Amino acid sequence: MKIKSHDQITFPEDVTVSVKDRIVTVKGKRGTLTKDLRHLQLDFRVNKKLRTFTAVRWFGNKINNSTINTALSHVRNMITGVTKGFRFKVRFAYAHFPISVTVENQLVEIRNFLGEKRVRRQVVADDVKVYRTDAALVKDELVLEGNDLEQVSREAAVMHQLCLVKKKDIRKFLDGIYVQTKTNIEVDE
């Protein structure tokens, strides 16, 4: 056996984080967002109590070394939601057949596809919030936003997968409801 070791966490600034357990509890502007990690524990060492946290390893295996990054980033992104949130833009896109999506709020209702077939419905999970916006030339547009990209995204990606089609060629297929901007709610501090 060859030493990686295990441990905990890297850091930036204005947002509190757990620093303890498998679980990072990140707290900032937009609240607090927290995740529990499995085998993802790794050479921590606090560099400042409040001001510097890293986890950038001593020895171990190849596979180990990757994770370290993947770990920071994601929790960084825990910070991101907590700070500047996520805002996904989607637009329904269709040409031969018009397509309509509303938002119940608690759930998203999707109409029309190909004359409509089934009604695609997605319940609005927590903090992915959904807006059909339309003025300002907001346009066939859904907006998913909240302070967890992964969720905002997951729900989103899910949506792209909710607008799938089969049988009788991608070379005539396009139409569906596609991701148009995955972002933050804004720039924020």
């Binding site: 056996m1 990686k4 295990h6 085998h39």
Partner: protein, 200 residues
Amino acid sequence: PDIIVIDLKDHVLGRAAAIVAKQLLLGKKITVVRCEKLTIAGSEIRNKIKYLQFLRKRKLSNPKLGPFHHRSPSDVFIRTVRSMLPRYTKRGQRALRQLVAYEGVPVNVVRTGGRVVIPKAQRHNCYRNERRFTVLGNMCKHVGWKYSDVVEKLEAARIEKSGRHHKKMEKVRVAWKNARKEALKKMPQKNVEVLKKFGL
């Protein structure tokens, strides 16, 4: 030792089995609980395939007589232990007849003692503390295994009362702490009292 009850929270399945196997063999009625936290290696996929395949067989004419699959977490283990025991030994059988396991934990019986686990059977201790692994209940869930939900409930209760108890002890134990003290260094000196270095 009498009336034995072992706590299987986080114990390496095979090893624990085997270990027990010898124990049973050397003859003693022993008991397992926290059986649901008995452990299986790696992935549920892996655990399933194995079980599935096990479950899958038949005794073709009368499939009702090849192997049966009491899918309790207990039953898994124990049967393993039977497997690790020599079944058809008339002696082992009696041995079996001795052996006790309940899934989960029927409560009242752990309270002045019960601190008991068994050597090698400590799953992290056995498993590399960085290798992946999967939990028994999870398996039994995977093959259904009915009571899981219930079991949960039951567990929560168990903890509570135990906590209740525990708080109570907590109180006395300070008194118990408070056990002298005072005149107690007037332990001797002739023929070399170092009770002061010994237990005091």
